[model samples]
Target chain A: MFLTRRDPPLSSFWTKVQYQRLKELNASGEQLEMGFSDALSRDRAFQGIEHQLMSQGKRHLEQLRTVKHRPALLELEEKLAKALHQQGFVQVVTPTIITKSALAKMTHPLFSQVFWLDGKKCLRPMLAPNLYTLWRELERLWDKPIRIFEIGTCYRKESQGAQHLNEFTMLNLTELGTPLEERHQRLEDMARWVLEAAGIREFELVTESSVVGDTVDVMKGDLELASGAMGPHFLDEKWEIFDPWVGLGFGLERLLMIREGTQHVQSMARSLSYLDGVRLNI
Target chain B: PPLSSFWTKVQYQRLKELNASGEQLEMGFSDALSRDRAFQGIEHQLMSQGKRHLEQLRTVKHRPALLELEEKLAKALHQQGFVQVVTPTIITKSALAKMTIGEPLFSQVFWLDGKKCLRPMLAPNLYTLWRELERLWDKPIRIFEIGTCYRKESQGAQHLNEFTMLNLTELGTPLEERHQRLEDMARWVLEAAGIREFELVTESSVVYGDTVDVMKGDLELASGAMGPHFLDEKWEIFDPWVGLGFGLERLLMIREGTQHVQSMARSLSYLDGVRLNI
Candidate 1:
């Protein structure tokens, strides 16, 4: 029979702090079994985790200062850009503020969460729309097999969560005028190329369905890091492109989070609460 | 003389095609030659220069020089013990209100929805970061971000609806050294951007009250300031700190000697200051 009597329950704030401390230490099951209000043991555990995080932060800053390493997100962006450039892709910069008509072509229900500027414009919710605009113009101007990519900010009024951000960085690359039969293979190849460039060794390409059509999602565990698709998609019809195309969009912060082995994306993102994976509240 | 005028007009269009300097074309057309010979000479120069510019664009992947300047500034600052950061392009209205309550700057801000807006400047977000960053790191924390900022302004040769800004700040500096530190940072940024001559002029800002503006003739290249009061009243930051903000497009215009900022900006009509339509 188990003992029924127990000490007073800890407040929610102390409970959260203890849980965070345990995660930081990678605490064993036995360590986590202790009562949250046990001052002596909890204080010891907190001190240990704090020391560990402080030391890690110092090492991170040292490497950053010495140029021996960079923040993984920036490093990944540079690598992916270089890799894509070598494969004959041209990088373009597009305006973050896009027209509502542009968003209409891509988002179903027209993305009610978009940050609208003035009346007819909104912050871009995805990079695909601008790329489509570019493709429509570029296909007419450039030769067949035009390859272009852009890395920029996209905004959405997302529900608060560890994974969702109102503003985030996106890397979108598209190839136009590829052979129809080869489009899927090219999508896989480009996905693999970007993942490899980002130093992500293991991932699964899971097939998924979306408003645009079938998507091949780059999955690490259950998390979807990127999505690649081939067209004659529904959106492509608006851009008036009849040629076969392949494109992929990846969340840069997700890549950094996975690489750094962190639970919260805020640690790797533009945030007021964290810097280079270090929590500020401490 | 009528035939010469028509030929000169045709020659002007050809010169534009070559992306030739107006001064050079003046000399090219002004020199004495028969109309047919002058036409041939202008055509020759056009083809040669057009081929050169085309080859340059093709080989260079059509990237604007402004991006290269950003990279150079980031690299130089990174090597100088400053941590490069990227912040959200969208910020809250309350955030803007914290920096200034004036009409001139506030009215020009691009409002998004009701509660949010595109960041008019990087300082509000940077201030928030510095407040939190000081708690996590040791004294003398240095951070910087280079990204797009937005403002709604009357159209002009100098204005852009969207432009890039580089804002860097160092927190927890010694009080006596703040002015010297600001000068040092301005020099570092100007040198990195390849500007050799500039003047430091004292000025007042709606937000920071007093600032030292880095001027190159009539153009304000950058502005630097310090704060005990500027940040303390709003962000509760009491440390003596120095900050600097530079307009990347303006710097590129100054460096490249472009008459209009639009020529160096991202556009459908121009690439690397060359008119694509022409």
Candidate 2:
């Protein structure tokens, strides 16, 4: 399930507490700030924590690799992507962000380091611009057989803390052409497989509440229409109709953390040895 | 505005200190935007002094040990068929950020030479180097370079967008061999640096590995079991792969039993202490 939270700014006191929490969780703290946002995003202290995470992330990405597959994890990711394509999901391509107009029209509250260049003071929203493109591409490929996923870098305008990061990586996927029911089944199966692979065997899934609404136009009570001026015959009709849709968001980070029996979220961001080193140093 | 005032005050303070110390110095702003540029705002003289301190420490009391460490490091490189090469600093932005091996995040931005742009990682540069020098070296190449890298990272003590990276690569070789070679070199470096009381901790899975295995229980007995070199450290074998990286600054701090990590960042001598701390 996607982990969502209200964005908060990083200050000196918060940074210290966050660092302490990171140490307790045996996790490295990395910071990602928007290139076009405020100058003092994550305070100086949090910046130090970011360095620690970077050093650790670099250390792990370089040193580990499997024999035939090189980095087994990346290979698995590629395999998953290929499987998705066979399922008829069109890929949406997007960028970091150039304007607020690019964001989805959904009612979701706007947050993060993304800003409107019109000089209006607001919380900068950091979003996956590439993911937006991927989503749009899927929409364009609507009714066609296509499925797609993108595992890449994404940023959150938060702080450099154990649980929070001004920047973090994200793996986003979108699927089209499949019915809502089929989508649910596929996502459930995918989550199960991912958890099993990561050595996690226990978890619970929750459903979000939805709003109910009545049809605006009453079909049965519709009045008769006059004869058309054109050649076509005038007609009146009445019927009922309904449409259903479903979507799911999975946190690959949380899945890995649970599999490794790692309590802190940030621990999943780097290698275990790096965690041990941080623990030792702390 | 507040930050600019703060910087002005710092500049004035530094000028006063330099004059009092009878040191020749000159300072000027590159542009109005330099204040916002992270790397440009860094006090280079202070950084230089830190490097000097490290150099002095190595040159003085720990000269022999430092030399031995370097020799051992070189030997490990030779065993791994890694040729030492001094690569150029300047690199095209696209090449640095677009290596096939890993996704490029650091290539996003850089603050160097009073300019902001992207900086390339060593891997892609190494690849480029191989293509350029392929004819000169008849055999396949394994290259290693320790140098400064610049990237625009959010400012913090534990994080610097621009820092030192010890990068190595085994080109035209099997992936397994490269993995093995990286582990070997990492272990050798730790041992040479007086950290032998550890075990190999490797990744059970990728993008996630653990390489630091601490050996506990019967420290004295463990020390006795290993040779004279490992007698003091008594570490367990741990290798969490993306190869292994030991933050030289942190390692040196721990070796010297220093409580503060800023010591290395503040003075080059303390950094040198890392090489000679053992």
Candidate 3:
């Protein structure tokens, strides 16, 4: 049987990739490249590739011991967490499934296709909401310059693409009640600490205006690694708070992706299909 | 003009969730569109399937089917006097190099460090066990591993980037009956899988010469060979053996007659081959 639907006016990237194939072949095999792409043909290639797939290993498969290593993504998380904790930031584990109102504030107008658990609860799209909820209450229970951070998974019903993943780990760290004049430098320094701890240096602290007002975006070219914000922001009023503070949130996988020079984010995620950024299906 | 740059965290997490679920997500839809088609479409989709997804959560059967099939296969092999072994999912380059995974397929490997990689197949680990177990167990040491294997399969004719493989092998098979033993094992596993139609086709593979494949309709359900071959010398495996590796998802695909291979795989996109979300 044939899947006529298999070829969907392929994506521009796929189109470019096909063209690149022609270029690789000296444009000589361009016309000849057209052939039957049936299951039979793929099966034939499968057998050949399977041979190659199996062929790479020790001549002696004997006496091999398991190699111990940490997943780079989680390692980066610990590094970032340690850097924050070094600065007196309290590490907090919060609920991934949040009530509708927990998200109403940082609504940073935020996030996505609401990955809902029920009518009243959806997966959290950002860590800021829960962070704000904790800090709002902590203002009285503790003291000034309260520092809190969370490194956890957040969800959104986003599209799948090379530069995207529907679920990913985010590291959000913020310090509240800092002097208003020092808020700007405080945000930048915190951003520097996390990035430097993760071994990322090629970055720019570009400023951008948003629905939440001015925020510093940590960018590597067009790719943004983190977002830095300073407040008393407008949304803070809803949380019953009046504290000059700064916070930065980073995409941990994006950090890992660049660190390894890989493109797709799928292999770097929390998955069974991939182990430590290695895809298992061939 | 950078707008809503801060939503990078939100957008990144969304990317991971959707993409991890096996949907190809579009990037930058958030940049230009707000209350546009994406939100409208997403809202409509959630509304349509929001309750349906929850309801189906109780009634659906893909995961149960996969696990049951796995359990059934384990029972089949165990009844056949085979011992199931669990090994690490990662392996060292020294061990991988044993597979003779040559030029073209070398790039397919997932190298973790300069010295390590995500184990691509159960074979290397299985092969390693052959000699060690041969040293420990008696003749005709039977073993199987139903675990995940890593490879760089870019796409598939029902191919997956990740898959579950059921590799069962017997060491020190009586040399004269390798063929008969192969047929017997194929029947035991395939029949145990509860398929109404199947056949055994003898064929040749790229590495192993003159192999026997278990075919379901026109598709190869499992490919195997009786060994006393070139690669066996590397492992000091002087005994005759029969080994068959099955793509569990493909087997489930044929059994359930589902659409694609990943449908039956360990995925957020599909459960027991049923599509999720919408």
Candidate 4:
């Protein structure tokens, strides 16, 4: 068979660009053997990204004209907030910069994956610690079944993987005193309602292992869209949280990535390079 | 007056914190009832004073200024038909390399990995997008991005390593309208950011020769440029464009009469013009 000139794999720099381009195109892995690693096939892939971008450019324009340019992330944030409110859950805005002592109430003591401010405070890594503190106080004063949720930004030095972000948006919901038998049922109901609010429908509630408790995960294939636990969980002692409860934490970027079909979570994040999962560079 | 909305929202939280931090006073009295009555007056006063301090934090400016100025500037840009574009905080050396020939910036940048970095400026991504967006959309395009930039800043009274930056770009401006256009945009954004008066001064640049800077007294609030030069080949751009970059934190610092830029930045220490420490 006659062979055409083909690249001997891309150099690391070009490979890096390729990786970025691949993610945007939703290409999982290079199909090098497509036409025996043919030059035409490789060139075609390179050119295809422009076509993909053109389609999305039109889509973004369409959205701009019709919706007056609301971002997918911001829109999702408002929708989630509305969803909770409609279902009788209250939206609570807490301090992003929190105390060190309150942090100890959350998991992973002496935490490293956080942004510390000045002398003694830190940017919150999760909403649990603050929510738990509120629950502890509200547990005594408020009626049972205190339903509260926070949709806010959470910080973490997680990974450079396509799935993680150093800074990401989080949605955490809690229903304290979820009726001892209703713990499992409410967790599923809560997941469905929150997911429905964001237009995500296909996810399975699968039991999973956890560092803190016997957590259940909302998954789509290998991706975990959400993870939850019912209390009195293994880690409840630190928060002084009693009375049976159900809580779920979701990464909204993950949900956005899943729903919008963005291959990278960073594109769906609070980024200057990306707005509404449409990479600005594209 | 709309700015007062933040004061009202924050006062609620301040009162929440006020109530939370109010310690139980077991005063010096042999009898329990007397102790309760004896401590009641002082405890209420202490909380009242703390609530005032929180209100003062709102009025004096600390937390809300960081986010408020950001919100205001974006609205300013949007009002002028500027589409708000966003980019990642971490950029690659590939993008940064195209930006300048010499960068004392190299040492100041925060690296996520060897190839990636926390952007010290906004133009690299803006320029990259400039090239691409023009290819698809019509020109005379107006776009802007307001986001944080990171530097290993020396912590000067004027500096913060992680600070907010706003860049406004208008491509394909009428060639003759270039100078007036720059002034037009600078004034629009500056006024929206609550700065009524500013001065334009000449500055030298390594990549962009003889740059124009927007200043208020001594502090450099922004810098402006027009392009169609060397970097165009790298970004694949060829246009008569104007760009205005503002130090959003600097704008707030100058407006609020804050001594340091850090106090007017996006931070865990401040919320809606109130310091979290209180």
lDDT of 1 by residue, A220-261 (tens): 898778888888887677778888898999989878877667
What does candidate 4's lDDT look like per residue over A1-282, in tens digits? 548575555422224565566565444443322332554555666567546764765577546423444467766876786677677675554555577888866656346777664456666788888777657754554477888787776777664345668777889998998888788888898899999998988889987666656677898887789988889887788777768899899999888888877677776687655556665554
The digit string of per-residue lDDT tens for model 1 on B209-274 reads 567888999878887888775546678798888899998988887787654576666655454555
Q: Mind giving the per-residue lDDT tens digits that candidate 2 earns over B159-215?
A: 433344445544444434544555555565666667765544433343322223323
**Positional deviation of residue B12's Cα in model 1 after best superposition, in angstroms:** 12
Which of the predicted structures, 1 or 2, would earn the higher lDDT when compared with the native?
1
How do these models rank on lDDT, best leading?
1, 4, 3, 2
Error of 3 at A216 (Å): 0.4
TM-scores for candidates 1 onward, in order: 0.81, 0.34, 0.43, 0.62
Q: Is the docking of candidate 2 incorrect, acceptable, medium or high quality?
A: incorrect
lDDT of 4 at B55: 48
Candidate 4 per-residue lDDT over residues B1-278, each given as its tens digit: 22122222343344333332323321235554554454455445545554465443323432145554665776676677777765666678888888875435567876655787768898888886676667556888787877767776744544565677889989898778877888998899988887878888766464555468898887778888877656667877778888889877677767865434554455434333334443
By TM-score, the better pick of 2 and 4 is 4
Native contact fraction, candidates in order:
0.35, 0.00, 0.00, 0.11
Top candidate, metric TM-score:
1
Deviating ranges (above 4 Å) for candidate 4: A1-59, A65-71, A74-211, A214-223, A228-248, A261-282, B1-65, B101-103, B202-210, B216-220, B229-233, B258-260
Which candidate, 1 or 3, would have the higher DockQ against the true structure?
A: 1
Candidate models: Cα lDDT each: 0.74, 0.37, 0.64, 0.68
